[PDB]
Amino acid sequence: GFVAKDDSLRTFFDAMALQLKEPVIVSKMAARKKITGNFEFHDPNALLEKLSLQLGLIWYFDGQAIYIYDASEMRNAVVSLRNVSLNEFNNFLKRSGLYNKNYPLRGDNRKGTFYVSGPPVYVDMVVNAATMMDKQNDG
Amino acid sequence: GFVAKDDSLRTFFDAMALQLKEPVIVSKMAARKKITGNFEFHDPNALLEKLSLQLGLIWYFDGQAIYIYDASEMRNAVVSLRNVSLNEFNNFLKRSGLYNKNYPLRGDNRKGTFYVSGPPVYVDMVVNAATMMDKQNDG
Amino acid sequence: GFVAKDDSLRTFFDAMALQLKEPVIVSKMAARKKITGNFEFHDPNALLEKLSLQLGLIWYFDGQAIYIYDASEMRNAVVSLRNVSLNEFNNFLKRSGLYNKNYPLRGDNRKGTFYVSGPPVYVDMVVNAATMMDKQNDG
Amino acid sequence: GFVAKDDSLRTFFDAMALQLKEPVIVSKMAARKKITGNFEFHDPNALLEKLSLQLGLIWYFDGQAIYIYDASEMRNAVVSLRNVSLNEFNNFLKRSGLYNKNYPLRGDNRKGTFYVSGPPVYVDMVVNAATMMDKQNDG
């Protein structure tokens, strides 16, 4: 695996990227911080979720690459959904493979809106998809 | 065949291109990465699909040349199909020889749209063809 | 005939042109590539079709000169034919001596269009002729 | 006659012009090519048709001068003939002395058009005459 001794997170996630196929893109904000410890590379994704609790990093795999950001870079959005059922759009993203259970969407079956919270690429994916799906049924 | 010892992918795919008739065009992003290993050239296409799992490369043969890109260069598109049946257009591309089973199109027989995902030339081919076929029946 | 020993295709097709009456015009893209082997000049046209399988060259004789291009220079076009039967225009070109069986036209007797594929001069000849014939019956 | 030993076609046709009354005008494209062989000047016109098969030269005598061009300089045209019968205009040119049996016009008695093919002066003569004759009966 890898023993980090005050090494940058970028160095650390590059060492993790050596065990991965897809590219790993670490934000500048995360790259500036350092990490120390003996980290077994049996499951790089478990390290990513581990540092959500240890350092406060968030990430999203979009199917082609792993984006790693600081949790303070997390984006929030308010998205109305007039022509699509809130449960229907949730299933749509789950069916699409875009939805991420680590960053749940905050809907309300008594209202016509929902909230998006997550890393910048996760938020952009949900919000763009929501726009597409609502306007698609607009007629 | 060819024994790669930290050689660029461009070098590697040029060595594969020596066994091929058509030109092989490797993206700059792929050309910058390197490859190591003993690769038998009994089937260059099997090496191309192999590196979809080993390195994360995608490709498309358009009938005249082989385009090789990084999987992160993969393009996505949202294409409506109002005047052509989704199954009819799928068969059209399969009949045309444009459709590629390695990059399936994502249709839905309960909706009037479908999604395109693949390397930049595969996406452009499907999307341009979709535009042609829909507008063609627009009247 | 001619023994090519790493000679340019232009040199090679010039040696073939010595046995021909009409001029042979080789593209720059083809001229840049080289060729090796003992080539009997008993039938220059058989060498031209041979290199469609060996090197991946395409060509067209327009009645006055032989155009030689790389297969990657091949052009494609989408041509509607509203006022002329698809079989009638096929026969027209066959009757005209413009049609080339090495580069078949892709029609469909259930539709009002057809596709053109071939070297740049073959495509331009079919497409210009198609325009002429359709507009000719437009009234 | 004249024994050509790698002499320009212009030199060669100048030697033929010495046996002719009318001037002989050779294109620059033809003038640049050379010719070798023992050519009897018993019939300069037979040499002109001979080189249509040997070198690929085309020519036209317009009554006042002999124009000699390369066959690749051959022009083609599409000419409609609305107010004159296709056979009537053919006879007109045959009667006029403009028509040349070495470069037949391509008519169709089931259509209202015909095609012109020949050296630049032959094509211009037929096409200008066609314009004259059609517009002449336009009323």
Residue numbers in the entry:
A (entry chain D), B (entry chain C), C (entry chain B), D (entry chain A): 34 to 172
Quote the paper:
The bacterial injectisome, or type III secretion system (T3SS), is a specialized syringe-shaped protein-export system utilized by many pathogenic Gram-negative bacteria for the injection of virulence proteins (effectors) into host cells. The injectisome can be divided into three major regions: the inner- (IM) and outer-membrane (OM) spanning basal body with associated export apparatus and ATPase components, an extracellular needle, and a terminating pore inserted into the host cell membrane called the translocon. The major structural scaffold of the basal body is comprised largely of three proteins that arrange into a series of highly oligomerized, concentric rings: two intimately associated proteins localized to the IM - PrgK/EscJ/MxiJ and PrgH/EscD/MxiG, and a third protein belonging to the secretin family of OM proteins, InvG/EscC/MxiD (Salmonella enterica serovar Typhimurium SPI-1, Enteropathogenic Escherichia coli (EPEC) LEE and Shigella dysenteriae nomenclature, respectively). In summary, we report the crystal structures for the cytoplasmic and periplasmic domains of PrgH and InvG, two of the main basal body components of the prototypical Salmonella SPI-1 injectisome.
The stoichiometry of the T3SS OM secretin has been a matter of debate, with numbers between 12 and 14 proposed and recent studies favouring 12 for the secretins of other systems. Unexpectedly, the recent EM analysis of the SPI-1 basal body suggested a stoichiometry of 15. We therefore generated ring models with stoichiometries of 12, 14 and 15. Based on the docking results, the 12-mer model appears incompatible with the target region of the EM maps, having significantly lower interface energies and worse map correlation. Use of the higher resolution map, however, clearly favours the 15-mer assembly, with the 14-mer configuration having significantly worse correlation to the EM map and Rosetta energy. Using the high-resolution map, the modelling converged on two opposite modes – a “helix in” conformation and a “helix out” conformation” referring to the orientation of the helix in the N1 domain of InvG. The “helix in” mode shows excellent agreement with our previous biotinylation and cross-linking experiments, and better fit with the EM map. Finally, for InvG we observed a loop (residues 95–99) forming a series of side-chain contacts with the adjacent subunit.
